[PDB]
């Protein structure tokens, strides 16, 4: 939809990735101020409000902690407490039809000052006073739901821009929306460090002849020294041997 009908999508249980935004795919803009671009894919976030809609491209440069403008304070407010990032991509063909796409309108001259992250799906008659008009804007109200240029080559003042604003709240119990541990390949017959789902150690780990049970993960000895393990990805059994030492 357009910005006047902006989509509030509560989204979680996902894989936060910034590669798709710039380098995996060359979307127009990925902008934010407090959270680093590179740290999105390795921190785990509970839930995120996604503001997914289409806005005028002319006021995308209005998108800032302040920088009030047509969109920034009349179509959707972007305050300083921007705990998240905005992902916009140009949609010249997608949101501008040659024959007139009189559907992705914009809420011009909004009724009231935009509330903090207001659900500006409010699509009503622009407020002027206490006059009960007969459905016709009289002398002080325009048509707030006004149409863009709607050309395939929209000017600088009417560019078509798609927007997903991610604002993340990790205050609630985690829904674990993040990439899981970066699982490398497996090493046989080499003294290496290792972390298996919380089990931290260092040794040489090799193929085994022991047989486990479906509920069993670890393996010990007389003195509670970890001796066997199962690969988290797939069913198999690896013995662990300490790296050699001695006297010289």
């Amino acid at each position, epitope marked *: *939809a357009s910005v*006047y*009908a902006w*989509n509030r999508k509560r989204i979680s249980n996902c894989v936060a990735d910034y590669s798709v935004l710039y380098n995996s795919a060359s979307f127009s803009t990925f902008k934010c101020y407090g959270v680093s671009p590179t740290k999105l894919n390795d921190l785990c976030f509970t839930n995120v409000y996604a503001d997914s809609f289409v806005i005028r491209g002319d006021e995308v440069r209005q998108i800032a902690p302040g920088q009030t403008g047509k969109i920034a304070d009349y179509n959707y407010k972007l305050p300083d407490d921007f705990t998240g990032c905005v992902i916009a991509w140009n949609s010249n063909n997608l949101d501008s039809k040659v024959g007139g*796409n009189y*559907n992705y309108l914009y809420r011009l001259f909004r009724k009231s000052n935009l509330k903090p992250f207001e659900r500006d*799906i409010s*699509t*009503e008659i622009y407020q002027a006073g206490s006059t009960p008009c007969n459905g016709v804007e009289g002398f002080n109200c325009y048509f707030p739901l006004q149409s863009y240029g709607f050309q395939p080559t929209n000017g600088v003042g009417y560019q078509p821009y798609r927007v997903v604003v991610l604002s993340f709240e990790l205050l609630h119990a985690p829904a674990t929306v993040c990439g899981p541990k970066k699982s490398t390949n497996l090493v046989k017959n080499k003294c290496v460090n290792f972390n298996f789902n919380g089990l931290t150690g260092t040794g040489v780990l090799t193929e085994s002849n022991k047989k486990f049970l479906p509920f069993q993960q670890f393996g010990r000895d007389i003195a509670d020294t970890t001796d066997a393990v199962r690969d988290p990805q797939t069913l198999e059994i690896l013995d662990i041997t300490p790296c050699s030492f001695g006297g010289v």
Partner: antibody
Amino acid sequence: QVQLLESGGGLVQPGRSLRLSCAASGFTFDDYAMHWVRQAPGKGLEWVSGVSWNSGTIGYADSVKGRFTISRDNAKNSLYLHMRSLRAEDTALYYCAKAVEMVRGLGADPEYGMDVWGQGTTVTVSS
Amino acid sequence: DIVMTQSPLSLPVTPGEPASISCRSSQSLLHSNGYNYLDWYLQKPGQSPQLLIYLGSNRASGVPDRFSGSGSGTDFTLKISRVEAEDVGVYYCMQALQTPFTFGPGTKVDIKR
């Protein structure tokens, strides 16, 4: 069960703006497309507009494109279509329908094969 | 708008006999897979409208499968294999790719004696 309640129209003298509302149930709102399709009493059905999982509206009909304004209230499962200059071509039973296809109907939103239909409004043009 | 028409508009058909109806659209419906989008629907005075066949040829649910769809691009011909007073009525077809969408006249199908 399913029973899509749409209303908002009535003794409407032409040249005024309203907000037709459809409430729907039996599914998940913000992941299925609700479509306005008009059908005047004595006249055949005609597509008006739609809104999808990404609120993906598309357009309006032949001579009505632009006066209408499509907005969604995802939480309470509501769909508000703005009414401007409702005349004999602009008045009809504003049926709200759901397409059976799931996410990524292909690129386009699920908007075809909408066999399930609610009860449209009764916008009237004579006072 | 879309210049949409149906043929024949009003043919006398005796119930129990096949009946061919058409649709000519104006704006193309081809995605890059060979997709035909002009679904076939039916309208009955008193009850909810019937969706005849979705995606042109995939016989839609909720109605008897006696309708058979064919065609390509914007041309969409549905032949009712054996229409019954239950399947006789006003006929329409809907498309959902490029706005605006404008409909046909609506093929009136009734009982022929």
